[PDB]
Design an enzyme around this catalytic site. Structure first.
Site, PDB file in Angstrom:
ATOM      1  N   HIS A  62      47.810  56.175  39.927  1.00 24.16           N
ATOM      2  CA  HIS A  62      49.273  55.139  39.233  1.00 24.16           C
ATOM      3  C   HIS A  62      49.869  55.667  41.058  1.00 24.16           C
ATOM      4  CE1 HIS A  62      49.911  56.358  34.979  1.00 24.16           C
ATOM      5  NE2 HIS A  62      48.833  57.804  35.767  1.00 24.16           N
ATOM      6  N   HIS A  92      53.004  62.053  47.602  1.00 19.33           N
ATOM      7  CA  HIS A  92      52.964  60.898  47.168  1.00 19.33           C
ATOM      8  C   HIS A  92      53.521  59.530  47.782  1.00 19.33           C
ATOM      9  CE1 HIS A  92      55.005  62.607  43.912  1.00 19.33           C
ATOM     10  NE2 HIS A  92      55.757  60.521  43.792  1.00 19.33           N
ATOM     11  N   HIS A  94      55.979  55.938  46.740  1.00 25.16           N
ATOM     12  CA  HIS A  94      55.643  54.506  45.447  1.00 25.16           C
ATOM     13  C   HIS A  94      56.261  53.811  46.855  1.00 25.16           C
ATOM     14  CE1 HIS A  94      56.324  57.685  41.916  1.00 25.16           C
ATOM     15  NE2 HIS A  94      56.898  58.370  43.251  1.00 25.16           N
ATOM     16  N   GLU A 104      62.656  53.869  44.862  1.00 24.25           N
ATOM     17  CA  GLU A 104      62.730  54.145  43.373  1.00 24.25           C
ATOM     18  C   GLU A 104      64.418  54.698  43.983  1.00 24.25           C
ATOM     19  OE1 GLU A 104      59.866  57.294  42.209  1.00 24.25           O
ATOM     20  OE2 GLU A 104      59.577  54.983  41.014  1.00 24.25           O
ATOM     21  N   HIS A 117      57.484  61.238  48.253  1.00 29.17           N
ATOM     22  CA  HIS A 117      57.815  62.405  47.880  1.00 29.17           C
ATOM     23  C   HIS A 117      57.155  63.471  47.841  1.00 29.17           C
ATOM     24  CE1 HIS A 117      60.150  59.824  44.426  1.00 29.17           C
ATOM     25  NE2 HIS A 117      60.215  59.845  45.265  1.00 29.17           N
ATOM     26  N   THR A 196      60.142  60.979  37.910  1.00 33.80           N
ATOM     27  CA  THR A 196      60.006  59.915  37.734  1.00 33.80           C
ATOM     28  C   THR A 196      59.364  58.320  37.083  1.00 33.80           C
ATOM     29  OG1 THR A 196      58.776  58.408  39.987  1.00 33.80           O
ATOM     30  CG2 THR A 196      61.772  59.413  40.011  1.00 33.80           C
ATOM     31  N   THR A 197      58.098  59.586  36.834  1.00 30.61           N
ATOM     32  CA  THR A 197      57.493  59.203  36.085  1.00 30.61           C
ATOM     33  C   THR A 197      57.125  60.087  34.532  1.00 30.61           C
ATOM     34  OG1 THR A 197      55.228  60.336  36.562  1.00 30.61           O
ATOM     35  CG2 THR A 197      55.617  58.681  38.445  1.00 30.61           C
TER      36      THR A 197
HETATM   37  C1  LIG Z   1      52.289  65.751  36.190  1.00 26.31           C
HETATM   38  C2  LIG Z   1      53.521  65.863  36.994  1.00 26.31           C
HETATM   39  C3  LIG Z   1      52.949  64.560  38.141  1.00 26.31           C
HETATM   40  C4  LIG Z   1      54.691  64.349  38.620  1.00 26.31           C
HETATM   41  C5  LIG Z   1      55.109  63.047  38.530  1.00 26.31           C
HETATM   42  C6  LIG Z   1      56.298  62.615  38.745  1.00 26.31           C
HETATM   43  C7  LIG Z   1      56.282  63.332  40.487  1.00 26.31           C
HETATM   44  S1  LIG Z   1      57.589  62.166  41.259  1.00 26.31           S
HETATM   45  N1  LIG Z   1      57.667  61.311  41.319  1.00 26.31           N
HETATM   46  O1  LIG Z   1      57.981  62.747  42.232  1.00 26.31           O
HETATM   47  O2  LIG Z   1      59.417  62.477  40.228  1.00 26.31           O
HETATM   48  C8  LIG Z   1      55.969  64.439  41.150  1.00 26.31           C
HETATM   49  C9  LIG Z   1      55.384  64.661  40.138  1.00 26.31           C
HETATM   50 ZN   LIG Z   2      57.326  60.288  43.187  1.00 29.13          ZN
END
Ligand SMILES: CCCc1ccc(S(N)(=O)=O)cc1
Ligand SMILES: [Zn+2]
Ligand SMILES: CCCc1ccc(S(N)(=O)=O)cc1
Length: 258
Positions: A62, A92, A94, A104, A117, A196-197
């Site tokens: 992803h 990470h 996007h 985002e 992020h 956001t995922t």
């Molecule tokens: C298991 C969840 C992992 C996770 C998903 C999404 C994000 S975010 N894009 O920063 O909202 C951070 C961690």
């Molecule tokens: Zn993110």
């Protein structure tokens, strides 16, 4: 899990397996700068990353994550809208297929080329898994990327991407200093939101910095050479791994600055 960013498994489909996708505090959102209000109750923000211990970089199909040792208070975020101490676990990005998209969050509907992020969990809950069952379990520090001059503190990340091209690949990424990814100013907007995922859990205090960092065209181009797919599978370029802005609903965005 078979969600992704394609026409057939992307953000418009997520609600079928993650109904919270249509919830009351989903992220990202558009930040209307004129509607955001300065909040004098916000305390100074403290980003304390001096003892950060990076471990590994991973392509999860992803995005790519740089993971940290969070077994102790080594790299933490405090202050601002936050009550208590939030420990850095990973960062990470996007990003887009073109420079005009990829973020985002948006600012007055403006999309940036990418968004960083830095993900933190509230230590009062003991572990990340418990934290994502709480309305104040997570804090994500979001930083916009625009294309211009190179970001020297990003280059070590860019250089290692060749070794994690496909889903499931990882590489050692010790001794990385995430302080090299920040802009000069810590001015920010904040609001309550979600991951956001998928699983889209509504556990996040979002802190989005006003000042973007600049990265070079060559740096972001390297992100776009990553693959969503695993080794030996048909190649799908890892691009446009962003969720668009979601309804603000009953929320107010607060600004740290006048
Ligand atoms: C298991 C969840 C992992 C996770 C998903 C999404 C994000 S975010 N894009 O920063 O909202 C951070 C961690
Ligand atoms: Zn993110
Ligand atoms: C063959 C997989 C089809 C598919 C599964 C799951 C999702 S979702 N609701 O985005 O997690 C979308 C498409």
């Amino acid at each position: 899990h078979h969600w992704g960013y394609g026409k057939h498994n992307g953000p418009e489909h997520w609600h079928k397996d993650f109904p919270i996708a249509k919830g009351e505090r989903q992220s990202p959102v558009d930040i209307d700068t004129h509607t955001a209000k300065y909040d004098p109750s916000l305390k100074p923000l403290s980003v304390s990353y001096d003892q950060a211990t990076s471990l590994r970089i991973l392509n999860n199909g992803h995005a790519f994550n740089v993971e940290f040792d969070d077994s102790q208070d080594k790299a933490v975020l405090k202050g601002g809208p936050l009550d208590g101490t939030y420990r850095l676990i990973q960062f990470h990005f996007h990003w887009g297929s073109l420079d005009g998209q990829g973020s985002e969050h948006t600012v007055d509907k403006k999309k940036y080329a990418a968004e960083l992020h830095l993900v933190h969990w509230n230590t009062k809950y003991g572990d990340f898994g418990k934290a994502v069952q709480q309305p104040d379990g997570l804090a994500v520090l979001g930083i916009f990327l625009k294309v211009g001059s190179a970001k020297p503190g990003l280059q070590k990340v860019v250089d290692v991407l060749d070794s994690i091209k496909t889903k499931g690949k990882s590489a050692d990424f010790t001794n990385f200093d995430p302080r090299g990814l920040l802009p000069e100013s810590l001015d920010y907007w904040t609001y309550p939101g979600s991951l956001t995922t998928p699983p889209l859990l509504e556990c996040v205090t979002w802190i989005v910095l006003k000042e973007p960092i600049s990265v070079s065209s060559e740096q972001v181009l390297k992100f776009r050479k990553l693959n969503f797919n695993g080794e030996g599978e048909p190649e799908e370029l890892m691009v446009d791994n962003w969720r668009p802005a979601q309804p603000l609903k009953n929320r107010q965005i607060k600004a740290s600055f006048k």
